[PDB]
Motif scaffolding. Structure first.
Motif, PDB file in Angstrom:
ATOM      1  N   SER A  79       0.843  -1.182   0.000  1.00 39.74           N
ATOM      2  CA  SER A  79       0.000   0.000   0.000  1.00 39.74           C
ATOM      3  C   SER A  79       0.888   1.245   0.000  1.00 39.74           C
ATOM      4  O   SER A  79       1.552   1.554   1.000  1.00 39.74           O
ATOM      5  CB  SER A  79      -0.955  -0.063   1.206  1.00 39.74           C
ATOM      6  N   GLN A  80       0.863   1.952  -1.117  1.00 44.56           N
ATOM      7  CA  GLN A  80       1.663   3.138  -1.348  1.00 44.56           C
ATOM      8  C   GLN A  80       1.686   4.036  -0.124  1.00 44.56           C
ATOM      9  O   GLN A  80       0.632   4.501   0.315  1.00 44.56           O
ATOM     10  CB  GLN A  80       1.070   3.884  -2.538  1.00 44.56           C
ATOM     11  N   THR A  81       2.860   4.279   0.414  1.00 40.80           N
ATOM     12  CA  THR A  81       3.115   5.183   1.521  1.00 40.80           C
ATOM     13  C   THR A  81       4.098   6.252   1.076  1.00 40.80           C
ATOM     14  O   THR A  81       4.786   6.039   0.078  1.00 40.80           O
ATOM     15  CB  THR A  81       3.654   4.403   2.716  1.00 40.80           C
ATOM     16  N   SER A 170      -3.104  11.688   6.877  1.00 41.34           N
ATOM     17  CA  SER A 170      -4.086  12.243   5.941  1.00 41.34           C
ATOM     18  C   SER A 170      -4.855  11.029   5.475  1.00 41.34           C
ATOM     19  O   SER A 170      -4.497   9.910   5.860  1.00 41.34           O
ATOM     20  CB  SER A 170      -3.501  13.069   4.803  1.00 41.34           C
ATOM     21  N   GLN A 172      -4.688   9.439   2.807  1.00 43.89           N
ATOM     22  CA  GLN A 172      -3.927   8.541   1.977  1.00 43.89           C
ATOM     23  C   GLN A 172      -2.679   8.038   2.676  1.00 43.89           C
ATOM     24  O   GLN A 172      -2.088   7.065   2.223  1.00 43.89           O
ATOM     25  CB  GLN A 172      -3.561   9.246   0.659  1.00 43.89           C
ATOM     26  N   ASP A 173      -2.312   8.641   3.798  1.00 49.48           N
ATOM     27  CA  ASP A 173      -1.124   8.309   4.572  1.00 49.48           C
ATOM     28  C   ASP A 173      -1.487   8.140   6.050  1.00 49.48           C
ATOM     29  O   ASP A 173      -0.838   8.665   6.932  1.00 49.48           O
ATOM     30  CB  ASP A 173      -0.073   9.369   4.280  1.00 49.48           C
ATOM     31  N   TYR A 176      -3.466   2.544   7.595  1.00 45.08           N
ATOM     32  CA  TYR A 176      -3.295   1.682   6.455  1.00 45.08           C
ATOM     33  C   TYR A 176      -3.883   0.312   6.711  1.00 45.08           C
ATOM     34  O   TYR A 176      -4.617  -0.222   5.874  1.00 45.08           O
ATOM     35  CB  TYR A 176      -1.822   1.538   6.134  1.00 45.08           C
ATOM     36  N   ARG A 179      -8.122   0.594   7.006  1.00 43.02           N
ATOM     37  CA  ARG A 179      -8.673   0.952   5.712  1.00 43.02           C
ATOM     38  C   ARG A 179      -8.751  -0.267   4.790  1.00 43.02           C
ATOM     39  O   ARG A 179      -9.750  -0.443   4.097  1.00 43.02           O
ATOM     40  CB  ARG A 179      -7.841   2.082   5.115  1.00 43.02           C
TER      41      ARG A 179
END
Ligand SMILES: CCCOc1ccc([C@H]2CNC(=O)N2c2ccc3nc[nH]c3c2)cc1
Ligand SMILES: [Zn+2]
Length: 323
Positions: A79-81, A170, A172-173, A176, A179
């Motif tokens: 998951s993009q961090t 946020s 998106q960050d 993780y 979600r």
């Protein structure tokens, strides 16, 4: 016509009787946990590092050592961090995972990423090795009783990765772990085969713990749809106190408080709750005075508190599960 989802709106507590608690107050022993449950978590453990893994194993061994029949299932993902993709893994620990209904407990084992300021590291003492380690001596204490579980409802324990955020909270960050799962657990029908219900559909109740370990905590009653389960937690406290089973505790300086307040504190309950589950989010407000510092260490803990907060959460569930 899914009846059995409907079964957490109304489900009542199996309230224990005077000397039933007076055992539970002696079935649970803090120090052990503190030597054995806890202190193997007090190492850096952000994701992708070895302190993850190591945190992951020490949790599981202490969910395998048990006589109860836990089934530990992992949820690994990428998951993009803000430091590019990486590898996360929720722990799960369900009793009877085809049981339609699960009271849930929860708490992020990862820990924020903090530069070794003054040569020092951030282990996450309140935040949240205490919840995880609070969530082991349950298991252990309630080993003797959970074994009777082999009103279709049992228990389940989750452990999150990347609650926190690498750089700046946020959408998106942050969170993780949760979600990704709360996603999945709405897509994984349940029980296996159910054509109109998803595991969430059984998640009776999301008791979340987090930021636990400092003196004089203050737990608001965030939600209207889980008051009656907040209240439950005050009650238990009230009398435990008036029997003599608590340690450095005062009516005035009680923990839960039926004073709703300002507003929301977003945490890993959210993705589920932003999907329609009852939470029992157990996050003090004010946070500890150390929150995200290299002083969130072990010293700045309070034995007597978690011990006290230990007793309450084991009782609550017993009553809950009806055991
Ligand atoms: C006395 C300390 C008060 O500081 C606050 C800290 C966190 C928050 C909450 C509110 N909204 C968030 O997003 N918060 C937040 C930020 C980072 C976290 N790491 C774990 N839990 C967190 C909550 C509010 C006040
Ligand atoms: Zn934090």
């Amino acid at each position: 016509a899914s009846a059995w989802p409907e079964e957490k709106n109304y489900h009542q507590p199996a309230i224990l009787n005077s000397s039933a608690l007076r055992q539970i107050a002696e079935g649970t022993s803090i120090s052990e946990m503190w030597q054995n449950d806890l202190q193997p978590l007090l190492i850096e453990r952000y994701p992708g590092s070895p302190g993850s893994y190591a945190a992951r194993q020490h949790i599981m061994q202490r969910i395998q050592r048990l006589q109860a029949d836990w089934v530990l299932e992992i949820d690994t993902f990428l998951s993009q961090t803000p430091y590019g993709y990486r590898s996360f893994s929720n722990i799960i620990s369900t009793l009877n995972p085809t049981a339609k209904r699960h009271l849930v407990l929860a708490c992020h084992y990862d820990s924020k990423y903090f530069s070794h300021w003054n040569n020092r590291v951030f282990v996450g003492a309140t935040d949240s090795a205490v919840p995880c380690a609070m969530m082991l001596e349950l298991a252990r204490a309630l080993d003797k009783k959970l074994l009777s579980l082999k009103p279709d409802l049992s228990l389940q324990l989750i452990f999150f990765d990347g609650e926190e955020a690498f750089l700046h909270w946020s959408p998106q960050d942050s969170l993780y772990g949760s979600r990704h799962l709360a996603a999945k657990m709405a897509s994984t029908p349940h029980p296996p085969g159910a054509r109109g219900t998803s595991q969430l559909h059984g998640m009776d109740l999301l008791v979340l713990l987090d930021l636990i370990g400092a003196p004089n905590p203050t737990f608001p009653n965030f939600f209207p749809n889980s008051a009656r389960w907040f209240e439950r937690l005050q009650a238990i406290e009230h009398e435990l106190h008036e029997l003599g089973l608590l340690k450095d505790h005062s009516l005035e300086g009680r923990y839960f408080q039926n004073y709703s307040y300002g507003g929301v504190i977003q945490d890993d309950h959210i993705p589920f709750l932003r999907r329609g589950v009852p939470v029992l989010h157990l996050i003090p407000s004010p946070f500890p005075e150390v929150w995200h510092t290299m002083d969130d260490n072990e010293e700045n803990l309070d034995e007597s508190t978690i011990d006290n907060l230990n007793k309450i959460l084991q009782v609550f569930v017993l009553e809950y599960l009806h055991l």
